[PDB]
């Protein structure tokens, strides 16, 4: 049997954490960067997440009505003397353990999407003398490094870097920043034209040759395109193979161009779709002859008429978002609305259920579209 | 804020030992669960002094008075818990569907260290019985 001992006061510093097989594998890895790390945005408001090197989990506490005692083996300083009163259902004791902790809850971990902390990130418009716009801000604490950014962000390292490259995040004069849409894509176009002007291998582009090919003509005083900017553009519109060279993608850039067209032409006034397809169609900046598809014209506009819409300007609360959405367009296409609500599910489960719960599903023969009340 | 989990000691001890076979972790730690509240005396010091040698109910370890409140008996899946001289609870040794990690949170330095991994527990879901 086992002798059970108890301390007069338990230490509440000890806590129980649920360990998934994946989390166990992660725990049992000698070199997983910083192994496992507890991360949080603030001290008194924001939630707390547990991050590995490539994944992010949300913590959930769950209390129970039972008594759970965490006990450990110890070698008793004094020989335990006791008269044996009952032998039934009992073997002779051979060890002594003592309860050092009493837990009343468990910590469940759920797989979740990592997000970036864009609290102290400025906007770059290509403006000269940016340092003054940096130092004269409310937060005297300036985001110096990317490590500092990751440390104060609810995400894993790889997710954080991937999203940082996905949003076209960059750094000027040692300060992290976000490029405006116009400047970012203009930079893209200039990069493309310059790369084709020097007959650069688009499948294997590097930083040095591209940088030299871009700012060779324009004077340095009006040349903001440094190697870091180039690296940002490449990390946004291309994929590296050996990780060291870059290879450009194609559908993402053309669709993004359709978005640029959108911010320019259908922000002020709307116009019937067949007409808009014609005018949109007359726009061909890229040398490469782009193809149209109905899937490409989805998620950046709303309706026999079409109008530009920015996702950032919509309310963040689901019910209100759907309310204003029902105010904006009486009849919706399925594929038009899927990308517009995918990112903001408060339930976080499934896609269709969210749509039917918050709207009126009214399919049709061509496609299973959506309707308003 | 943020801080890493230190699992080096746990890893060295884990690699040099088995995956858990019985209820004892390779590190010499276990998990006890009772459906109820554990009722203990209000004055530990007093009973430690009135405690007689025949009883051996109290002892000193590192300046702390520990009480021997019971015995645990494993005969397989079946388990029996003796409390005091007059109480018996029937329970089972169950394998955790989700293994629980025991971690020590050092508030002083805001550091977290992995203590051990529980794969089993001794649970008692039934009403305490007569001796």
């Amino acid at each position: 049997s086992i002798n059970l001992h108890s301390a007069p006061e338990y230490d509440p510093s000890y806590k129980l954490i649920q360990l998934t097989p994946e989390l166990l594998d992660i725990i049992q890895d000698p070199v997983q960067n910083h192994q496992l790390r507890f991360k949080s945005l603030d001290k008194d408001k924001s939630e707390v997440v547990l991050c590995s090197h490539d994944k992010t989990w949300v913590l959930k506490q769950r209390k129970h009505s039972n008594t759970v005692l965490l006990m450990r083996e110890f070698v008793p300083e004094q020989p335990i003397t006791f008269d044996e009163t009952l032998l039934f259902g009992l073997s002779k004791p051979y060890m002594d353990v003592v309860g050092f902790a009493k837990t009343e809850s468990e910590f469940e971990t759920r797989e979740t999407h990592g997000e970036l902390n864009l609290n102290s990130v400025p906007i770059y418009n290509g403006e000269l003398d940016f340092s003054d716009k940096i130092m004269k801000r409310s937060s005297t604490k300036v985001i110096g490094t990317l490590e500092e950014l990751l440390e104060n962000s609810p995400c894993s390292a790889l997710e954080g870097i991937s999203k940082w490259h996905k949003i076209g995040g960059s750094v000027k004069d040692g300060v992290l920043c976000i490029l405006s849409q116009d400047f970012l894509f203009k930079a893209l176009h200039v990069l493309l034209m310059s790369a084709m002007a020097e007959s650069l291998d688009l499948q294997h582009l590097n930083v040095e040759d591209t940088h030299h090919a871009v700012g060779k003509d324009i004077e340095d005083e009006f040349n903001p395109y440094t190697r870091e900017i180039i690296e940002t553009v490449l990390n946004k519109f291309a994929v590296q193979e050996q990780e060291n060279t870059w290879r450009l993608r194609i559908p993402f850039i053309a669709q993004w161009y359709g978005i640029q067209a959108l911010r320019k032409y259908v922000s002020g006034i709307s116009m019937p779709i067949d007409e808009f397809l014609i005018k949109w169609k007359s726009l061909f900046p890229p040398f490469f002859p782009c193809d149209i598809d109905i899937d490409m014209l989805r998620g950046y506009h709303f309706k026999k008429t079409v109008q530009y819409i920015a996702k950032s300007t919509l309310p963040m609360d689901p019910k209100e978002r759907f309310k204003v959405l029902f105010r904006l367009q009486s009849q919706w296409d399925l594929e038009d609305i899927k990308p517009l609500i995918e990112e903001l599910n408060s339930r976080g489960m499934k896609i269709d259920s969210f749509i039917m719960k918050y709207a009126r599903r009214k399919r049709l023969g061509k496609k299973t579209v959506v309707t308003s009340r | 804020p943020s801080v890493d989990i230190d699992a080096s000691q746990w890893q060295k001890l884990t690699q040099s030992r088995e995956k858990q076979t019985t209820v004892i972790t390779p590190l010499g730690m276990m998990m006890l669960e009772i459906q109820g509240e554990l009722e203990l005396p209000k004055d530990f010091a007093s009973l430690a002094r009135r405690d007689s040698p025949n009883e051996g109910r109290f002892s000193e370890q590192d300046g702390e008075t520990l009480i021997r409140f019971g015995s645990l008996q494993i005969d397989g899946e079946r388990a029996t818990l003796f409390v005091g001289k007059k109480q018996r609870l029937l329970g089972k040794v169950t394998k955790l569907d989700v293994p629980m990690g025991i971690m020590h949170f050092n508030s002083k330095d805001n550091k977290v260290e992995l203590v051990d991994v529980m794969k089993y527990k001794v649970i008692f879901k039934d009403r305490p019985l007569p001796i």
């Binding site: 959930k60 506490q61 039972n66 | 109820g36 009722e39 409390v83 005091g84």
Partner: peptide, 26 residues
């Protein structure tokens, strides 16, 4: 009298998961 005992609970209630604040930990 005065023997150690265990206050048995009639039922087992299980709470719903909750968000974790930094203050809840420390």
């Amino acid at each position: 009298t005065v023997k150690i005992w265990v206050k048995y609970n009639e039922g087992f209630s299980n709470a719903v998961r909750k968000n974790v604040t930094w203050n809840n930990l420390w």
